Amino acid sequence: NKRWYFTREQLENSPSRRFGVDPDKELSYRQQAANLLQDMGQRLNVSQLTINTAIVYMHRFYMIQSFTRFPGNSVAPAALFLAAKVEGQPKKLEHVIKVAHTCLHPQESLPDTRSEAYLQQVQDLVILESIILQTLGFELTIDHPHTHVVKCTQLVRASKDLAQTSYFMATNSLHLTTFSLQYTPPVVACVCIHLACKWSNWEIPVSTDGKHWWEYVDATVTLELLDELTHELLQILEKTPNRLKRIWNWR
Amino acid sequence: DSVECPFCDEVSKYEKLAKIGQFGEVFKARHRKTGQKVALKKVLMENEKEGFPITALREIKILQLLKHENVVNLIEICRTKGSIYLVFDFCEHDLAGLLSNVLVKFTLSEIKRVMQMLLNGLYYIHRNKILHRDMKAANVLITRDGVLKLADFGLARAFSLAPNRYTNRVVTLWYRPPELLLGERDYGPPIDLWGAGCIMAEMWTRSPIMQGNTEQHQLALISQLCGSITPEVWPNVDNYELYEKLELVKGQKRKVKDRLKAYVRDPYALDLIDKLLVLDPAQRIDSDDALNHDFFWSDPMPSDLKGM
Numbered sequence A: 001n002k003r004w005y006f007t008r009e010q011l012e013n014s015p016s017r018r019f020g021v022d023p024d025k026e027l028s029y030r031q032q033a034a035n036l037l038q039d040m041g042q043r044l045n046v047s048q049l050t051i052n053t054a055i056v057y058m059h060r061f062y063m064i065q066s067f068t069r070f071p072g073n074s075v076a077p078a079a080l081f082l083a084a085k086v087e088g089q090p091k092k093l094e095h096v097i098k099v100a101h102t103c104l105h106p107q108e109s110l111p112d113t114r115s116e117a118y119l120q121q122v123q124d125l126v127i128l129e130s131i132i133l134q135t136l137g138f139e140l141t142i143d144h145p146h147t148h149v150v151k152c153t154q155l156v157r158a159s160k161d162l163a164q165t166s167y168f169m170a171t172n173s174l175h176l177t178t179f180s181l182q183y184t185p186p187v188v189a190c191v192c193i194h195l196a197c198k199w200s201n202w203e204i205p206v207s208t209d210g211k212h213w214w215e216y217v218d219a220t221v222t223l224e225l226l227d228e229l230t231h232e233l234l235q236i237l238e239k240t241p242n243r244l245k246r247i248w249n250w251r
Numbered sequence B: 001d002s003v004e005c006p007f008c009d010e011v012s013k014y015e016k017l018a019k020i021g022q023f024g025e026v027f028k029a030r031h032r033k034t035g036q037k038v039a040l041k042k043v044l045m046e047n048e049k050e051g052f053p054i055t056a057l058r059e060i061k062i063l064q065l066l067k068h069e070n071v072v073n074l075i076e077i078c079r080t081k082g083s084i085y086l087v088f089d090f091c092e093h094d095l096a097g098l099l100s101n102v103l104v105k106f107t108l109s110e111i112k113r114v115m116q117m118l119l120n121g122l123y124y125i126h127r128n129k130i131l132h133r134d135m136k137a138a139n140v141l142i143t144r145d146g147v148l149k150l151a152d153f154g155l156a157r158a159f160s161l162a163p164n165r166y167t168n169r170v171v172t173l174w175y176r177p178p179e180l181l182l183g184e185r186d187y188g189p190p191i192d193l194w195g196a197g198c199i200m201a202e203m204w205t206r207s208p209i210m211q212g213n214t215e216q217h218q219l220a221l222i223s224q225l226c227g228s229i230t231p232e233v234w235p236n237v238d239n240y241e242l243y244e245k246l247e248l249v250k251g252q253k254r255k256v257k258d259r260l261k262a263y264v265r266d267p268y269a270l271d272l273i274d275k276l277l278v279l280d281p282a283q284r285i286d287s288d289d290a291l292n293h294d295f296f297w298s299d300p301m302p303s304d305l306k307g308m
């Protein structure tokens, strides 16, 4: 139950670190895998939910395995192959090999579906899917902040706009951070509303009780923490090119 | 080289003891260190060209979710050092092998209990948005200490209120509801409650009460025990295409209570079966309303099991 939540001291000392991989570096090995995932998932016309699931799989997978033995470009397609089944949007093994290929080698031509070369990479993926399964120890039912986002936004009568922004934040928290490895969906969700508000100059009228909007969503949540985390998230958002422009008010 | 794997134990930590089934390949086994008995279902990677089988994922999804004294219990999942084993608590009996063996005998108190545990087991899973889709005595295990468990969630699937388009090819023929035989793809719980009706009868008869060779044959046995399918009895049956496109008697009257007086004595018990074996799903008794039936609340009261 605390199995896939780790402390900052555990996150630092990770399977990859113990094979020489710097923190900053490992951290961008994840971001990269997440990109590959989103890239592939859109071409395979699966949902964001399915993509998010795969990303969380990827995240937890590398809290056990190292990037120096399992390359993101190999894990990401297998993780997405899995998430799609698990989420009801099954895509065919040959179909996923295809798309992974063009994503990782936009130039290179596809091998003869009959060759020994191609017959291997199919083998490989399937093997990998098996290792992800065992590595996760068959716990594939994920819970994403997005569910809770709806709830927090009824609790502020928020406009479409502010709602959409919060989801944006949510999705980006997975691509860009390791929150999903540290904080439970509901908490992360509050973080995503907090910063969506900040980013939009949206105001939160204290309840009549002196209660804050969040305490309704997760008891363990303190503003002292909200500020700490929305800072962290915003910081990397700013490091990420073009991403913020997506929600910037051009007017 | 070897790979790190903290949450999947090699199944070698159990010692196999005996085959027991029958989809798929299922062994009793003993934990090498503690003696704990377990059941292992191997996951069959034969004819599986799409990686790890989606249905296995479904089942494993559902077993991890359903946690309850009347639902079989998935302890863990194991690997070899290649395939994959589901690991359950071991159940000493199953209701089929109890109903065949002729030395085994049931008091009314013992029967009320079995049914009670089974209707509770259903309420639970239905409440959790799951349809079992494989009701049959052979899937109803009992434990040495006398507790009932439901099993084989191999066909189970989740359900919602979205109209739906669920698979029709489900449930062993002898326990399939009418609804299904008429090509229904938007069904729900009442299909599992039909099963329970059949099993409830099978408790006094030692035998499946409607043994058909095919759909045609089956449906006819049903219309023979529960009357004909008319919109006066089951409003809106005509709405189905397979309705007229099929041979069904027209002069049939409900002999549900008549045919069963022989083996079943208790009148409350009869009244209950009759609300379980109801043609129209939307008129067929709830698993809640059934546990609330005077059958469970009259003498003899339901008793524990040591009539083993």
Ligand SMILES: CC[C@@H](CO)Nc1nc(NCc2ccc(-c3ccccn3)cc2)c2ncn(C(C)C)c2n1
Pocket (backbone or CB within 6 Å): B018, B019, B020, B021, B022, B026, B028, B038, B039, B040, B041, B072, B088, B089, B090, B091, B092, B093, B094, B138, B139, B141, B151, B152
């Ligand atoms: C769809 C599931 C059906 C189909 O096989 N069966 C089934 N039967 C069981 N036992 C009741 C019995 C106990 C022992 C034996 C026997 C037979 C030969 C030799 C030794 N023992 C047979 C049945 C049982 N116990 C645990 N499980 C889990 C896997 C759920 C069980 N599943």
